[PDB]
Chains A and B, each alone.
Chain A
Amino acid sequence: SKKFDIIKISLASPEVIRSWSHGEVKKPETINYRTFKPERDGLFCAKIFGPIKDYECLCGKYKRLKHRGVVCERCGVEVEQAKVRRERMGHIDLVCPVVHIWYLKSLPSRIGLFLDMPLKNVEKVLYFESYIVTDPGMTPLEKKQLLTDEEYAEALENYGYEFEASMGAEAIRDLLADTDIESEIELLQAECEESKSTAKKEKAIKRLRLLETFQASGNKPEWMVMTVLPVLPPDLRPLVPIEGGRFATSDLNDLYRRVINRNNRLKKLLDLNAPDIIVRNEKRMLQEAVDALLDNGRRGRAVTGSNKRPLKSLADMIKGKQGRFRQNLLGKRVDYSGRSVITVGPSLRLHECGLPKKMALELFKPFVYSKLRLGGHATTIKQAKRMVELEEAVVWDILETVINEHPVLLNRAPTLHRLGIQAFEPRLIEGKAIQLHPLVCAAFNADFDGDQMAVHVPLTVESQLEARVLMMSTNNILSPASGQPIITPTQDIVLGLYYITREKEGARGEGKLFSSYEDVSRAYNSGTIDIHAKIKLRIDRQVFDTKGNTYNEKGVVNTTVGRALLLNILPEGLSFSLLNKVLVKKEISKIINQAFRVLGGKATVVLADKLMYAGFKYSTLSGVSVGVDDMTIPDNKEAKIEEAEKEIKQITEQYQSSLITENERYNNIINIWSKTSDEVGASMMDAISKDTVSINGEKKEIESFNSVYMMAKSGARGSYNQMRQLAGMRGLMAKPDGTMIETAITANFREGLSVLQYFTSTHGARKGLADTALKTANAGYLTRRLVDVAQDLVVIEEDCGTDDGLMFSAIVEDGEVKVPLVERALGRTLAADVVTEKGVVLLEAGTLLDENLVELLDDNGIDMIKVRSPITCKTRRGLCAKCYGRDLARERQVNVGESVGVIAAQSIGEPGTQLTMGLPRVAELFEARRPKDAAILSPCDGMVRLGNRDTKEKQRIEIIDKNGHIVEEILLPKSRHLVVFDGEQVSRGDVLADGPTDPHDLLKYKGLEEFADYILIEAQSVYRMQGVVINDKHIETIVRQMLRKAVILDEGDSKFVKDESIELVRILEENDKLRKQGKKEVEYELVLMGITRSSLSTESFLSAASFQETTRVLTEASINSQIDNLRGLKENVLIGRLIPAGTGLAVRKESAKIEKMRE
């Protein structure tokens, strides 16, 4: 269809390599010494590879386009475009065959497996150190027997001739070219029928899986030995000059010369009938030269160049972090792009950024050329190009009209999730930094102590619309990992709003009666009334409630002057009970939540801007600062510490009379100091929090307006321990191993640490800083694995019709709730009805639970529901909207085309840097690691017994034999406990031992539901301890990619217990339901992978070769002659076409409607 539909990878026959080429290169001559012209038959010739200048031959006889298809006679060169030097190969006619290093040393060896001889013996015959009998002949010998070149004369007075034996690569090529594949299948399927699968019936199983692979495709096995070499086009191993008469040549020309110069040498050595003892030494050298050209390091040591650095082969220009896949195909430096430092710019609207004139004039330069040459300023683009560099006056307003409604995207350094790119509307500023709205900073994770940002310009109307509709910063109001807002005011917007909404009891103007916001404003602007004075205000406003109805709020409320000054920004729909409180950080986020849920999108992005302005203004007018007397040190500290010291002295007094050993110098002194640390941290908050006034006999404690206290209690910035170290005592420190240093820092940062106290606190500081940078690699690796396992999961249909799910409950600790069923069932749709204990049902199956339906779950005493999970969706190569649930960032149900896989992968990974003591546990969960000494389950039921000869193989007697006969026996080590007592009646899934929980002994013995429950509570108990909140519907769209291959039980067209991808098992077991009748469809068992095995076992070689292990993947793909239906997200970015998600689906869908309407 007008463009390729698949990419296939084959093995190249010598007959087809000679078809790629355009001539043979014979001499290792690159370029001419003095003139800069290619040689005659060298690595760079022009008759082979093509002309150097466009449309002219080398000597210059035909220099024109008037000669399109001319070949010259003075020079064999062609008159054609010089771009063909990028495409046009030649070859190297080897005189000795040489094996392909990949098909020998890729572990396993597709060559040591065809013949069934260990590679330790193939490597002797291939590098000339032993013999093989290609044919034992009528002589008695064996076939694949290693004759020592000395033992090659075993009976040369009686054996002689009439049989063949050799060494090198023609030996192996003759062993391959004549080997009966059908016959080895014959006498190999007769060797696997035995069902004796102990030790040999596994090594004999792989050999025929390989031998049937060659019968199927057409690749002869003798093609794994090259009789001709191809050479890369010359413009891909270039010969750019250097500064001062030199050449920074490639390593691909070094390794080509090292091969031509041994080919020619061995050829003219063959011509002379030189001795065999040196011709063999040559042949072994020709082979190692080709193995280095293909990749050095596999077998050779370090074949090395001028600068003592090993040369770079062909199998290094496609593999690893700096190969082609990464660094060039998922990479791509781009045009229309820039950078700068970011500043704060707090007078912007949430949809705007400040863009310098100097940057914006470069980025938008062709747009400006066109708008000049349009509105009659320059005629041809040269004068316009000229007035752009002189920076005229008519240019700076054209630039203002061109970038008017043209958005730009801004990105930060590690794009940890999708909020790291947002689109903005630029307004030309002057200066050289970028201004960034204060509320989009916690998304980007930016602050203004040095960070930079990149600016990209969308060029097309489908990308300009995609910038506004999808990425623009006004749509990204809530997190995609939770539902929580991301535009919540943060640090000194929180402090202003917290300050003005507190209240002071006896204040100036207390009890007055106002009727408006204009009233309180006018009376405040006069200096006659406080901002913390209690007043009475009259309100009259409409308030939408949960059901959606709209009642009327009226009356006269008791307020504070400061709260009532915020009443101007509240929109209609929200009740004044939201503002009528002290407005800590939590409550401001709640205001923004309600504004979004009840009023929608722009109402919220207007309320947020106004809260920003008010906080910025009233933290200023407050003149809030920090001095050194805000850090108030309690008055009991010295007595507390002296009593701790006297107790320490008594503990060591005990120890000196030998009444305790480890306690009397540890675990007791450390507990004294750990208790005194917190008594002093408690005394310090009874001094920074309380206050005192006694004016009118008013002697009592009031809440303080201390500046250090108000910064913490506001939730704006600061903790209780950070405040405990400034004015309490720093307590116990850690040596890096983890133990506690017995002598505590009894001083805070206000009085100052001594030098022997400041020393012991540097161990912890260095340990923390060292962890911090030796950990982002651990988390970036996990994130990349997760994005490669789950990438191609997309929501592709509205419903799949399934009716199965999972039983959700409250995730208790075994002591208390720790999470309710509500907040766990919100957004998840029902799979079963939810009938109550009396008998009547509340909610039918198929209802998207939302906030207006989960109160019925808690008000009616329900505690276990069955939700439509995505581990149990019935969609093939995708998900459905009703099994996913809510969008978590739109607070709706998902749309068709929404890529849940990437979103799910960069929501478990983004908080990776926040948990390490931890991240190894989520690694050992998502990698399905069968733990050390896990347990032993119960395969069959019956009664329990045992039996053993103390041979460390204690067997099982689970045969009850009371209903008849039974065969239920096991084994184990003799030094472990069997959790089942001497007798019991234990069915499938019971534990006959104790230890870890193997995730594979949960999948075949207990089914999919116990496994899902296990991994789901386990992955969340690790994120919740650090206070990270991820929706568990994100962990479930990843477990779906760990259960995607099954081990076969029956058979309709495939082999036995060989694995298989479910979407293959399921499509044929649906032809048989049509083809014959049900034809014994196929029955199978689900098995469990890791996120790396699942991603390497993909059905795409282009997508698994991009991931890792590129050679181990490409050799297999080329032997099996695999085909890649593109079909995927990553596969579609390498070849540059629309991914099948988002707007790439909808353009197909919305275009299916047109050909229908034209019919």
Chain B
Amino acid sequence: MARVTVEDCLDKVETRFDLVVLASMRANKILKNGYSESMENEKKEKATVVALREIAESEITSEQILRNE
């Protein structure tokens, strides 16, 4: 609860349950891309908060783009 607020994301998503579903899809796609093991052990963040933050900034993803069918 340092610098990612759940109130910041409840302006984009619904129900506080949709937030969990969408954030988990985003996080799973981040983690199934590498994101570690090579050079950034203590130089990055957790995919959970990285995915939860891109929703609170209208960043790399919005709810409609989060699919990647």
A interface residues with partner B (beta carbon < 8 Å): 349, 351, 371, 374-375, 401, 404-406, 425, 461-462, 464-466, 468-470, 472, 474-475, 600-602, 895-897, 1142-1143, 1145-1147, 1150, 1153-1154, 1157-1158
Contacts and interface: CB of A to CB of B under 8 A. Distances in A.
Contacts of B49: 405
Interface string B11-36: 00011111111111001100100001
Contacts of A474: 1, 6
Contact of A469 (B6, B27, B36, B46): B6
B37 interface: yes
Contact of A461 (B2, B16, B31, B41): B31
B59 interface: no
19 contacts: A374-B36, A374-B41, A405-B45, A461-B27, A466-B20, A469-B16, A469-B20, A469-B23, A472-B1, A474-B6, A601-B6, A601-B7, A602-B5, A895-B14, A896-B15, A1143-B21, A1146-B18, A1150-B18, A1157-B67
B7 A602 contact: yes
A1158 B28 contact: no
A602 B10 CA distance: 13
Contact of A600 (B7, B16, B23, B36): B7
Contact of B17 (A374, A425, A895): A895
A1142 B27 CA distance: 20
A1146 B6 contact: no
Contacts of A375: 41
Contacts of B48: 405, 461, 464-465, 468
B27 to A, nearest CB: 5
Nearest to A424: B1
B53 to A, nearest CB: 11
Prevailing SS type, chain A contact patch? helix
Count chain B CB atoms within 10 A of each CB in A468, A469, A600, A1147 and give the residue with the most. Answer: A469
A584 B48 CA distance: 42
Contact of B24 (A349, A465, A475, A1154): A465
Given A469-B23, A602-B7, A1142-B17, 16 more contacts: A349-B1, A374-B36, A374-B37, A401-B42, A405-B46, A405-B49, A461-B24, A465-B48, A468-B52, A469-B20, A469-B52, A470-B20, A895-B15, A895-B16, A1146-B15, A1150-B22
Interface residues of B, number: 31
A524 B23 CA distance: 50
Contacts of A468: 1, 6, 48, 52
Given A462-B20, A469-B20, A1143-B21, A371 B41 contact: yes
Contacts of A896: 15
Nearest to A894: B15
Contacts of B19: 469
A404 B5 CA distance: 17
A425 B1 contact: yes
B15 A465 contact: no
Nearest first, the 9 A-B pairs at minimum CB distance are A351-B1, A1146-B17, A895-B15, A462-B24, A405-B46, A375-B41, A601-B7, A1150-B21, A461-B27
Nearest to B8: A602
A384 to B, nearest CB: 14
Count chain B CB atoms within 10 A of each CB in A349, A371, A462 and give the residue with the most. Answer: A462
A468 B1 CA distance: 8
A410 to B, nearest CB: 15
Contacts, number: 83
A425 B45 CA distance: 15
A472 B49 CA distance: 14
Nearest to B14: A895
Contacts of A475: 6
Contacts of A1145: 17
Contacts of A1142: 17
A64 to B, nearest CB: 38
Contacts of B31: 461
Contact of B27 (A351, A371, A465): A465
Contacts of A895: 14-17
Contacts of A401: 41-42
A89 B30 CA distance: 48
A1157 B69 CA distance: 8
A470 B21 contact: no
B20 A1146 contact: yes
B5 A1143 contact: no
Contacts of A351: 1
A401 B40 CA distance: 12
Nearest to A376: B41
A823 B6 CA distance: 29
Contacts of A600: 7
A462 B7 CA distance: 19
B16 A470 contact: yes
Interface in B35-67: 36-37, 41-42, 45-49, 52, 67
A464 B27 CA distance: 11
B23 to A, nearest CB: 5
Contact of B21 (A349, A371, A601, A1146): A1146
Nearest to A473: B1
B7 to A, nearest CB: 5
A538 B24 CA distance: 50
Contacts of B2: 405
B35 to A, nearest CB: 12
B37 to A, nearest CB: 6
Contacts of B21: 1143, 1146-1147, 1150
Nearest to A475: B6
A235 B24 CA distance: 40
A1154 B27 contact: no
A884 to B, nearest CB: 14
Nearest to A406: B46
A465 B9 CA distance: 13
